[PDB]
Design a protein around this ligand. Structure first.
Ligand SMILES: CC1(C)CC(Nc2cccc(-c3sc(C(=O)O)c(OCC(=O)O)c3Br)c2)CC(C)(C)C1
Length: 297
C-alpha cells in the first residue's frame, strides 16, 4: 500500500535506491526511426527518443517522424501523448499531430525559457490579432482567449485545417511554475492544476489523447501522467490500496523512456496520489482546499 510504502521509504531515506531500481527494470525498445540521419533536427535531445512501436506517426508520405509517444494505459483505459517541446522547425508537425490525433487538450509543464536556455519554441499565438499559419502542415492557429492565474494559464485556441476549413477548439493548460528537474510547490497546487485539466473534458475518451509536454517530454510530463493514471485506476475500482505506483510507472515506461527524471519527482508522485485519493473516495472539501492553498489568484 502506497501510504505505508511511502513512510517506509521516507523513514529509511531510500528514495534514490527506489528510483534507481525503476531505471534498472525499465523497458528498452529500439528507436531506429528517431535515430535516422534525416530526423536529427527533429529531436531536441540526442538521448531522448520515442520507441518505434509507440511513436506517433504524422499522416504524410514525406517524413512521418515526430518525437512523441502514445502512452496507452490499457487497464486505466486512458491514453496520453507525451512529446518534446516543439522545435522551431517542428511546430507545424506538432499541430498536425494534435489535429490528426483529435486531441482536445495540450498540457505544457515548462516555460519557454528556463535557466537561461530555450526549452521550447513559441508554438502558439500570444495575441489574438497575430494568429499563426504553419505553411508546411497547412494549419492556422488563433488565440481566442486566456485565463491567467498566478502559477498557470489556460488558453482557448482555434485550430483550423486550411485544407478542409474544418475548425476545432484546443484547450492549452500552461503550468508555469514547475521547476525543470524539480517538483510542483505542493501537492495542492499540482492537484488543483490537474483537476483543471480534468474538468475541462480534455481527458474524456470521446476525444483523442491529451498531448502532454515539458522540454524533453519525460520528467515533468512523466510525473504528471503517472499521478493522473494512478488516481484513475484507483477511481475505477474505488480502492486506493489496489494501486501499485511503481508498477504503473514501469507500465508507462514500456511506451516512452525515462518517465520521471528524479527520485524526488517520484516521491512527489506518491504525495500527489495519496492526497488526490481523498477526493476519489468522496471528500467534497479538498478540491476547494487545494484551490485555496494553490494561491491561483
Ligand atoms: C537514465 C537515463 C540515461 C537518463 C537520461 N536523462 C536525460 C537525457 C537527456 C535529457 C534529459 C532532460 S533535459 C530537461 C530539461 O528541461 O532541460 C529535462 O527535463 C527535466 C524535467 O522535465 O524535469 C530532461 Br528529463 C534527461 C534519459 C534516458 C532515457 C536516456 C535515461
Amino acid at each position: 500500500e502506497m501510504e505505508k510504502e511511502f513512510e517506509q521509504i521516507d523513514k529509511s531515506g531510500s528514495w534514490a535506491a527506489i528510483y534507481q531500481d525503476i531505471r534498472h527494470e525499465a523497458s528498452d525498445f529500439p528507436c531506429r526511426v528517431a535515430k535516422l540521419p534525416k530526423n536529427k533536427n527533429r529531436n531536441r535531445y540526442r538521448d531522448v527518443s520515442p520507441f518505434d512501436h509507440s511513436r506517433i506517426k504524422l499522416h504524410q508520405e514525406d517524413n512521418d517522424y515526430i518525437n512523441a509517444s502514445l502512452i496507452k494505459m490499457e487497464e486505466a483505459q486512458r491514453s496520453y501523448i507525451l512529446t518534446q517541446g516543439p522545435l522551431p522547425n517542428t511546430c507545424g508537425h506538432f499541430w498536425e499531430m494534435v489535429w490528426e490525433q483529435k486531441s482536445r487538450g495540450v498540457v505544457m509543464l515548462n516555460r519557454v525559457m528556463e535557466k537561461g536556455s530555450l526549452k521550447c519554441a513559441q508554438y502558439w499565438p500570444q495575441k489574438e490579432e497575430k494568429e499563426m499559419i504553419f505553411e508546411d502542415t497547412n494549419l492556422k492557429l488563433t488565440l481566442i482567449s486566456e485565463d491567467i492565474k498566478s502559477y498557470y494559464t489556460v488558453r482557448q485556441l482555434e485550430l483550423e485545417n486550411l485544407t478542409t476549413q474544418e475548425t476545432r477548439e484546443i484547450l492549452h493548460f500552461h503550468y508555469t511554475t514547475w521547476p525543470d528537474f524539480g517538483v510542483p510547490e505542493s501537492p495542492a497546487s499540482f492537484l488543483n492544476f490537474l483537476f483543471k485539466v480534468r474538468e475541462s473534458g480534455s481527458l474524456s475518451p470521446e476525444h483523442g489523447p491529451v498531448v502532454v509536454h515539458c522540454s524533453a517530454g519525460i520528467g515533468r510530463s512523466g510525473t504528471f501522467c503517472l499521478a493522473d493514471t494512478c488516481l484513475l485506476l484507483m477511481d475505477k475500482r474505488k480502492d486506493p490500496s489496489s494501486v501499485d505506483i511503481k508498477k504503473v510507472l514501469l507500465e508507462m515506461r514500456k511506451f516512452r523512456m525515462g518517465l520521471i527524471q528524479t527520485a524526488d519527482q517520484l516521491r512527489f508522485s506518491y504525495l500527489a496520489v495519496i492526497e488526490g485519493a481523498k477526493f476519489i473516495m468522496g471528500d467534497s472539501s479538498v478540491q476547494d482546499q487545494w484551490k485555496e492553498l494553490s494561491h491561483e489568484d
